[PDB]
Every structure is written in C-alpha cells, then in structure tokens.
Design a protein around this ligand. Structure first.
Ligand SMILES: Nc1nc2c(ncn2[C@@H]2O[C@H](COP(=O)(O)OP(=O)(O)O)[C@@H](O)[C@H]2O)c(=O)[nH]1
Ligand SMILES: [Cl-]
Ligand SMILES: [Cl-]
Ligand SMILES: [Cl-]
Length: 331
C-alpha cells in the first residue's frame, strides 16, 4: 500500500519529541472470538512471522502436547462409535480399542510408543472408525484430529521433533488474557488474546467450520451474538473492527457434504464454498448497526497457514496505518 506509506508520512508528532525518530509508535490490538476460533494460533503466527518464532528446542517442548492431542482425538472417535452405534469394520479392532484405553489409562501424560502407535494406526485405518470420523459433527472432536492421525508414522518415530505446523496444530488450554509484543512495519504491536481502553483495532475470529456444530445451541449463532455485542459497543467506535472468518480450509472440505441450512435454515443459495462463505460473511457484517459510520474489514483465513496469515496481517496493518495512526501514541 503506497497509500499507507504516504499516509503515515503526513504525521508530524515525532517532531515534538526530542528523540522522535527513535520513538515507538504503539498499536493496541485486541484478539477476540469464541473458544477454539483460532486466537492462540494467530498469536503463534505473529511470533513465527515477526519474531523468528518457534525454534527446534521450543518445538520439542510441545512433543507431549502433540501426543496428548492425538490420543484425545482417537479416543473421541472410538467413544463416539459406542454412542452412535457404529461397528468396527474388522471385529478385531475391538481388541485394539480396548488396548487404547489400557495404555492411555495407565500413563501419566501424553506419550507415544511403538505399541500405542500400532494400536492407533490400525484403529484409524478401519472403515467403521472412518465412518464415525466422518460424522464428527455429531460429537466433539479436535480440529486437528486428521492432521495428526494421518501423520502418525512421523510423529511416532523415536526421535520425532515437532515441526512448526505440528505446533500450530496443537490445541492448548489457555485461560485469561495473554499479552504478546511484536514489531512490524515499525509499529510496536501490543496484542491481547482474550479467552479495554485505547484499543486501536479488534481482530475477531470466527470458526467457519462451526456452522454445523453444537449441545442444544448452534456455535455459529453464539459467535454471531458475540460479534454483535463487540462490533456495536460504544467503546469501539473508532476502533478498526477486523473480522477473520477462520478455518476456511476445514469449511471448504465440509461444505461439500454438510449443508449450510443446518446453521441458517433460511439459506437458499447453493452449497458451495463460494456461496456459503459469502452468505456467512454477509450474516456477520449485517450485525453492524452503524453501516454509515463504521466499516468491517473481513478476511478469510487459515490461521495455521503461515503464508496466509502473513498476507492477511500485512493487509490488516495497512488498514490500521491508513485509519488509526492519529490515535496511536509515541512512547
Ligand atoms: N485446519 C485448521 N485448524 C485451525 C485453524 N485455526 C485454528 N486451528 C486449530 O484449531 C484449534 C483451536 O485453535 P485455537 O487457536 O487454540 O483457538 P482459541 O481457543 O481461539 O485460542 C487448534 O488446534 C488450532 O491448530 C484453521 O484455520 N484451520
Ligand atoms: Cl463399538
Ligand atoms: Cl517404544
Ligand atoms: Cl494466501
């Protein structure tokens, strides 16, 4: 954005400070959205992209988290089979299912051995297990279940070291409000992941692939309600409201087989990625009560995709530079 460079070059407030050219222009960014919408993943991406990121030794720290998530995923599927009354493809997998629970049951924390890897591999290749997997909207299953289970052989190797993508795919139970700092285009970002005064911008995350998920309340509806409060809150009048319609990769896969009408019974468009995503975007943007005063800046994201997040965050920063710089202090 040549317009961004020009816009920021119009500022003169550094001149009022003795060492103004060395001062830090600060941007305060609130990262919001329902649980599992992708907030932590965006935080990790900011570290990877703008701060070098996740070194091998750092990645190693996530090994047992990867194991934990993998064990949780397969157990979720196996348990759901009993509830949905889905039989194993090969009755022999029943012994493996039992063994899964024996091994997870006796251990202290996530782990992986050859024996466990074999049990999980055989379960995951079984046709009943796959049929239950494909009905995951009917229970609660980690988004990254397939990612880890399909790569089990690599993850189970004795000298396994998690990759960045392995780390980005983890589900980690975070609580409270976490602040991270990073500098990009010479802006000093202060990012708060809320699981606020002077907020320059809000990035609001939505899991697109929640549309067909729940117990007796639709997860997308809840995200809408939450965006509604936020977008029209008086405190955020001058705040740039950025909307990340996230998990577009998972959404693209689901929409082929699971109709949007599950979420919006009135939807009468085609069940294609293009029409259904557009419709969701319109549903969210329509919650904006001040359409003549405030614009929503919407992006379709895959938060685990570093190149996608770098591209999007670049566009978001140019919007901030063009609209909000005058409200950003020097420190
Ligand atoms: N496939 C896919 N997985 C994602 C995406 N965004 C987040 N995830 C995964 O979804 C899970 C929940 O994301 P997380 O960042 O922890 O959500 P948070 O509760 O808002 O902090 C994690 O396992 C992430 O790796 C996405 O765009 N695509
Ligand atoms: Cl069973
Ligand atoms: Cl072993
Ligand atoms: Cl991209």
């Amino acid at each position: 954005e040549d317009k961004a460079a020009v816009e920021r070059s119009k500022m003169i407030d550094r001149n009022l400070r003795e060492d103004g050219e060395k001062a830090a222009r600060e941007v305060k960014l609130l990262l919001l959205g329902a649980g599992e919408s992708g907030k932590s993943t965006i935080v990790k991406q900011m570290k990877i992209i703008h701060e070098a990121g996740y070194s091998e030794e750092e990645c190693k720290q996530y090994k047992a988290v990867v194991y934990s998530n993998t064990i949780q995923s397969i157990i979720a599927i196996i348990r759901a089979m009993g509830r949905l009354k889905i039989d194993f493809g090969d009755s022999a997998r029943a012994d493996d299912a039992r063994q899964l629970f024996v091994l997870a049951g006796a251990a202290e924390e996530g782990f992986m051995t050859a024996e466990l890897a074999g049990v999980i591999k055989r379960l995951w290749k079984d046709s009943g297990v796959q049929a239950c997997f494909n009905r995951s909207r009917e229970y609660q299953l980690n988004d990254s279940a397939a990612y880890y289970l399909n790569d089990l052989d690599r993850i189970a190797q004795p000298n396994y070291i998690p990759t960045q993508q392995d780390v980005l795919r983890t589900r980690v139970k975070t609580t409270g409000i976490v602040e991270t700092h990073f500098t990009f285009k010479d802006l000093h970002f202060k990012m708060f992941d809320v699981d606020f005064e002077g907020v320059t911008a809000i990035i609001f995350c939505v899991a697109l692939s929640d549309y067909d998920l729940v117990e007796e309340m639709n997860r997308m509806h809840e995200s809408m309600k939450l965006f509604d409060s936020i977008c029209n809150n008086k405190c955020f009048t001058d705040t740039s409201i950025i909307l990340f319609l996230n998990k577009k990769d998972l959404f693209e896969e689901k929409i082929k087989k699971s109709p949007l009408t599950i979420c919006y019974p009135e939807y009468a468009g085609s069940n294609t990625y293009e029409e259904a995503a557009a419709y969701i975007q319109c549903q969210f943007e329509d919650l904006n009560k001040r359409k003549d005063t405030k614009e929503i800046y919407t992006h379709f994201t895959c938060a685990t995709d570093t190149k996608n997040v770098q591209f999007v965050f670049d566009a978001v920063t140019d919007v901030i530079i063009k609209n909000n710089l005058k409200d950003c202090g020097l420190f």
